[PDB]
From Swiss-Prot:
Tissue: Expressed by activated lymphocytes, Langerhans cells and activatd dendritic cells.
Disulfide bonds: C18-C59
Protein name: CD83 antigen
Species the sequence originates in: Homo sapiens (Human)
Subcellular location: Membrane
Segments in the Extracellular topological domain: 3-81
Parent-protein residues present: 18 to 129 of 205
PTM description: Glycosylated when expressed on activated dendritic cells.
Length: 81
């Protein structure tokens, strides 16, 4: 709900986008998780996608000052065969 979706054919690579609303000119570090229960900054590369890669992912951008972070979610649906 309100979460964007990426569809990719199986065995293709995908660069999953970081949907955190980040600040320009801040040198973030990025950390990605899968929630179980390319010129775009901070994307997650997933090579040779398979059906099991489908799911909801969360990016978290950490401010270098260590006092702030920002997170956004994206859904991946793998649909080739």
């Amino acid at each position: 709900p309100g979460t964007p979706e990426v569809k990719v054919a199986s065995s293709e690579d995908v660069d999953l986008p970081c949907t955190a609303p980040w600040d320009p000119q801040v040198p973030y570090t990025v950390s990605w998780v899968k929630l179980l229960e390319n010129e775009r900054p901070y994307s997650l590369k997933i090579r040779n996608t398979t059906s099991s890669n489908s799911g909801t992912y969360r990016c978290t951008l950490q401010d270098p000052d260590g006092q702030r972070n920002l997170s956004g979610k994206v859904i991946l649906r793998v649909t080739g065969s």
